[PDB]
């Protein structure tokens, strides 16, 4: 389900951010790739410097491939 996935997204943010309010950019790349999300270079360059859980949840709901 989508709710199932949102809980997976949340727990993964906690893991990849080491329990922090903001995730380092290179760890954000690891986090998104762990869910199959591949950004283009200039999409990466457009990410804001400060990435919190709500940013990641909105991002993951937009980019995740629910077919796979």
Residue numbers in the entry: 1 to 68
Show me the paper's own sentences about this structure.
Proliferation and transmission of these obligate endoparasites in their host organisms rely on efficient cell invasion. This active process is based on the motility of the parasite, referred to as gliding, and is empowered by an actin/myosin motor. Actin polymerization occurs between the plasma membrane (PM) and the inner membrane complex (IMC) whereas myosin A is part of the glideosome, which binds the essential light chains ELC and myosin light chain MLC1 (called myosin tail interacting protein, MTIP, in Plasmodium spp.). MLC1 (in P. falciparum: myosin A tail-interacting protein, MTIP) binds at the very C-terminus of MyoA, while ELC is expected to interact with the C-terminus of MyoA upstream of MLC115. We demonstrate that ELCs bind to a conserved binding site on MyoA to induce its α-helical secondary structure and stiffen the MyoA neck.
Heteronuclear NOEs ({1H}-15N NOE) and chemical shift analysis revealed that the protein consists of an α-helical N-terminal domain, while the C-terminal part is disordered. Based on this finding, we were able to determine the structure of the N-terminal PfELC fragment (amino acids 1–74, PfELC-N) by both X-ray crystallography to 1.5 Å resolution and by NMR spectroscopy. The N-terminal domain of PfELC has a typical calmodulin fold with two EF-hands formed by two helix-loop-helix motifs. Both EF-hands lack the canonical residues that usually bind calcium in calmodulins28 and in agreement with that, we did not observe any electron density corresponding to a bound ion. PfELC-N crystallized as a dimer covalently linked via disulfide bridge, but both NMR and non-reducing SDS-PAGE indicate that the protein exists as a monomer in solution and the scattering data calculated from a protein monomer structure fit the measured X-ray scattering profile with Χ2 = 1.37. A comparison between the crystal and the NMR structure highlights that the loop of the first EF hand (residues 16–22) and the third helix (residues 40–47) display the highest degree of flexibility, in agreement with the heteronuclear NOE experiment. The lowest energy NMR conformers are very similar to the crystal structure, with an average backbone RMSD of 1.4 Å over residues 1–68. In general, the assigned backbone resonances in the NMR spectra superimpose for both full-length protein PfELC and the N-terminal domain, proving that the N-terminal domain maintains the same structure as in the full-length context. Contrary to T. gondii TgELCs, the homologous EF hand loop of PfELC (in isolation or in complex) is bent to the other side and does not possess the residues needed for coordination of calcium.
